[PDB]
């Protein structure tokens, strides 16, 4: 009588790993059927989980990523706990193959393993996104340097630096949106990136005008400054929106 929900995974990669399990769990939940001796297959799951936990502990204990270090354990904890339910189920089924409580454990344990493994994969996914965010923040920081460019020589250096930086950022975003399952988020990323790319030449043009105006005589630089600053502000707004969107999740990603 309880309703359930199989996840719409966060990325295509996670989907390809976990979809089979989710589909098989759904099939068993919906099925109309005694259960055979599951001691051995459950033991194989137990062994796999133990290996995974061992590797997870090594990672937690060696990673310099303080955030990964903190978010990982709860996921492995959920997986281990769910595994204990499968073990209990197999033990119960040895004496009573028709046990209803045993079947309940099998289902809860299977779902808990799916949910814990998904949580685990999402923690590693978040670490990957943090790498993209770091690049975005480097661009925001470099945009603050525009105001210090006051010679044509420095403008050449600046453009030759910001240009490739934007290209790298754009590539990371393009690759990321291609991995996302949620269409709404992909659209936002692509739209913001396009806006940012379009503003780049506008910024360089504004900086060239500022440099030219400054290095002249009796010209007022107030307008050139304003126009440069306006463009930097718009670009920074767009990049912050990319950073915000890269971190969005969805309710439909939960399994229950």
């Amino acid at each position: 009588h309880h309703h359930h929900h199989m996840p719409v995974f966060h990325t295509r990669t996670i989907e390809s790993i976990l979809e089979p399990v989710a589909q098989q769990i759904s099939h068993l939940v919906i099925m109309h059927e005694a259960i055979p001796d599951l001691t051995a297959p459950v033991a194989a799951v137990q062994a796999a989980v133990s290996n995974l936990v061992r590797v997870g502990k090594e990672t937690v204990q060696t990673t310099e990523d303080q955030i990964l270090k903190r978010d990982m354990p709860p996921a492995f904890i959920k997986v281990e706990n769910a595994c204990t339910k499968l073990v209990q189920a197999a033990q119960m089924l040895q004496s009573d193959p028709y046990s209803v409580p045993a079947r309940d454990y099998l289902i809860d344990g299977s779902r808990g393993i799916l949910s814990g493994t998904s949580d685990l994969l999402l923690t590693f996914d978040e670490a990957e996104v943090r790498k993209i965010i770091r690049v975005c923040k480097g661009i925001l920081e470099y945009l603050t340097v525009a105001e210090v460019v006051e010679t044509m020589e420095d403008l050449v250096t600046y453009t030759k630096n910001l240009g490739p930086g934007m290209t790298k950022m754009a590539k990371m975003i393009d690759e990321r949106q291609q991995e996302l399952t949620h269409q709404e988020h992909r659209v936002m990323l692509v739209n913001s990136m396009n806006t940012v790319k379009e503003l780049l030449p506008v910024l360089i043009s504004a900086m060239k005008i500022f440099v030219t105006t400054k290095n002249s005589k009796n010209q007022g630089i107030e307008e050139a400054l304003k126009n440069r600053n306006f463009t930097v502000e718009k670009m920074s707004a767009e990049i912050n929106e990319i950073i915000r969107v890269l971190q969005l999740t969805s309710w439909d990603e939960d399994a229950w």
Partner: peptide, 24 residues
């Protein structure tokens, strides 16, 4: 789909996840 098959799948999936970690 049966319990024996689902359990085999789970074990394989877990091994897959461990491998992802080991290669990262």
């Amino acid at each position: 789909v049966g319990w024996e098959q689902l359990l085999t799948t789970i074990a394989r999936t877990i091994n897959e996840v461990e491998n992802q970690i080991l290669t990262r």
